[PDB]
Amino acid sequence: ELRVGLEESELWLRFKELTNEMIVTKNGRRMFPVLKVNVSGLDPNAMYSFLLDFVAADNHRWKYVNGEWVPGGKPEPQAPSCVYIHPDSPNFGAHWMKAPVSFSKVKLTNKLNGGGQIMLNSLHKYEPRIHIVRVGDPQRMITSHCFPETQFIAVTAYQNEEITALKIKYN
Ligand SMILES: C[C@@H](CO)Nc1ncc(Cl)cc1F
């Protein structure tokens, strides 16, 4: 059976407890924690690409008021569909399964200024999603996994001082 497991799930849960925030900038900002997954049940002999995108969680935006995240108004129109290709792509099943797959280099941005960055709307909540794409497949088989522990609100600046502190503590 294909199994894609979240690495460092208890680290993600420490952030999710506070409501996780990721900074978006013009030139793009790397995530902490980094999304890392373990993989079993691929064909070790087959070739696959790993893709990452971010799914909008809500039909509204958020705002931080009196130390609480609350519904913050109607959403901005959906960010353009940005997909990040894991740089090891394409590679053998054996490659993806021998050690956790790390998306350490993906950058989150609030400006369409290229560089393979992911555009997100500030004060909107997103859920990372990984796609495994089989190479040379006439059926173009794709598998998609979502990671609920990794949900975060995109921000231009940290709202929760506990997130500011946690980001310093664990990074
Ligand atoms: C939070 C802590 C709980 O034992 N777990 C982790 N902490 C930090 C790193 Cl670098 C990775 C982890 F997996």
Question: What is the number of residues in the chain?
Answer: 171
> How far, in Å, CA of 48 to CA of 132, rounded?
6
User: Residue 62: how many CB atoms within 10 A of its CB?
Assistant: 23
Distances from the Cα of 30 to the Cα of 27, 35, 60, 117, angstroms: 10, 10, 25, 10
Q: Give the helix/strand (H/E) hosting 34.
A: none
Quickly count: other Cβ atoms within 10 Å of residue 75's Cβ. Answer: 16
Q: Is 14 in the pocket of ligand 1 (CB under 6 A)?
A: yes
Question: What does the alpha-carbon distance between residue 160 and residue 163 come to, in Å, rounded to a whole number?
Answer: 5
CA of 20 to the centre of ligand 1 (A): 15
The answer to whether the CB of 170 is under 6 A from ligand 1 is: yes
> Nearest Cα to 32, choosing from 105, 81, 97?
105
171 lines ligand 1 (CB under 6 A): no
Containing structural domain, residue 18 = 1-171
What is d(CA 22, CA 152) in angstroms, rounded to the nearest whole number?
6
Domains identified in the chain, total number: 1
Q: What is the DSSP letter of 80?
A: P
Residue 14 Cα: closest atom of ligand 1: 1
| Residue 169 beta carbon below 6 angstroms from any ligand 1 atom | no
Closest alpha carbon to 153 in 3, 19, 17? 19
- Which residue owns the Cα nearest ligand 1 atom 5? 11
Cα–ligand 1 centroid distance for 10 (angstroms): 7
CATH of residue 87: 2.60.40.820
Resolution (A): 1.5
